[PDB]
């Protein structure tokens, strides 16, 4: 029972790309030819990835081989198809039309099998909706390794909604999907690296228009993406903070502005700042918005945006009293880049320059962002 199969090279290159992003045994990939499919298994300390791709199975069997060596070779081969043949002397032959590679294999019995999940809840959502909630929350995870519980994305069902939420203490990001069926409340914290891997998977063109099944338990999360890709992940063992208290419940005024002109202007003005004072200042009035910054021993900068009801230059602030408030420009940019929207809204809770600011994008009612100001 020796593996032998013919595979479309471009298909194998894509699967190996996912395997590379997962990672002595962790350096290997397990290849299993069975029932018309090649199953590729990859694992590290926190993730187990199993991918099935259709191939011509000429003989069923299993081998394991270096992930890096296999990937490096296959992505340099110009043949539209490759033959993979397990040979007697613990070697995998990779054959193109004019070239042949023989790779040392390692015992299949040394490669770990996947663990299992006893889900508390399971549900199906579209890959496109799941990609959105991860894209809207992955950037505001804490990188402070002491804040163990903030080092991932909180995925939780509450009422009929599936939320992703993240915070680092300076900003909060929330994005959700409505679930049709009744599902009990449950939550887990997905590690950053697992969020990055599952995002790459669902965004693949083969999967982005399909569905992903999600299974949650107290100690694991399992993704089944478009039937043929399974990702099992450990969780962060912590309790996510109750962030509902962080969300402003009322506003005294709001800024509405063309998202691109706002993002581009923040980026230009922020160039003058120094690491010790990463801050830009917004001076808001009905007639104009001034964006300014200073940098010690560097200089200063300002840009003026004038009131406009035209979509491409939109600026309005319907309040008689002006407001001056500051923000970390990187944190504002993170939000503005997360949602492809023509306009963005900033809601101010009170006249102070210290209260949290709520950010929403019109036409995107299932994304909420909160950013703390900085003194300027």
């Amino acid at each position: 029972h020796m593996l032998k199969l013919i595979v479309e090279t471009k298909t194998l290159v894509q699967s190996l790309g996912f395997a590379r992003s997962v990672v002595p045994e962790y350096a290997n990939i397990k290849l299993s030819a069975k029932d018309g499919n090649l199953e590729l298994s990859s694992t590290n300390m926190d993730l187990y990835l199993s991918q099935k791709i259709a191939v011509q199975v000429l003989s069923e069997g299993e081998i394991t081989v270096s992930t890096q060596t296999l990937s490096d070779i296959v992505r340099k081969l110009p043949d539209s198809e490759l033959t993979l043949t397990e040979l007697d002397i613990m070697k995998l032959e990779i054959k193109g039309q004019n070239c042949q590679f023989n790779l040392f294999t390692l015992p299949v019995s040394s490669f770990p099998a996947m663990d299992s999940i006893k889900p508390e809840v399971s549900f199906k959502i579209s890959c496109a909706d799941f990609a959105k909630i991860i894209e809207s929350t992955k950037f505001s995870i804490s990188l402070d390794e002491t804040r163990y519980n903030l080092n991932g994305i909180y995925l939780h069902i509450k009422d009929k909604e599936f939320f992703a939420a993240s915070t680092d203490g300076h900003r909060l990001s929330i994005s959700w999907i409505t679930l049709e069926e009744k599902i009990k409340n449950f939550g887990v914290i997905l590690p950053q690296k697992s969020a990055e891997e599952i995002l790459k998977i669902v965004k693949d063109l083969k999967n982005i228009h399909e569905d992903i099944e999600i299974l949650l338990s107290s100690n694991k999360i399992k993704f089944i993406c478009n039937e043929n890709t399974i990702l099992l992940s450990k969780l962060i063992d912590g309790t996510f903070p109750d962030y509902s208290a962080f969300i402003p419940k009322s506003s005294i005024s709001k800024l509405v502005i063309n998202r691109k002109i706002f993002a581009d202007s923040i980026e230009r003005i922020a160039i003058i700042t120094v690491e010790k004072f990463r801050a830009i200042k917004l001076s808001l009035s009905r007639k104009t918005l001034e964006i300014s910054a200073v940098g010690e021993a560097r200089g200063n900068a300002k840009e003026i945006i004038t009131a406009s009801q035209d979509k491409e230059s939109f600026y309005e602030y319907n309040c008689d009293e002006s407001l001056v408030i500051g923000f970390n420009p990187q944190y504002l940019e993170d939000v503005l880049k997360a949602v492809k929207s023509n306009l963005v809204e900033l809601y101010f809770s009170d006249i102070s320059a210290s209260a949290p600011v709520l950010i929403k994008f019109p036409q995107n009612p299932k994304d909420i962002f909160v950013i703390m100001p900085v003194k300027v």
């Binding site: 203490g169 300076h170 903070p241 962080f246 949290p356 703390m372 900085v374 003194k375």
Partner: peptide
């Protein structure tokens, strides 16, 4: 650089 009202943490 004030934080969100995280208790504890701020």
């Amino acid at each position: 650089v004030p934080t969100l009202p995280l208790v504890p943490x701020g």
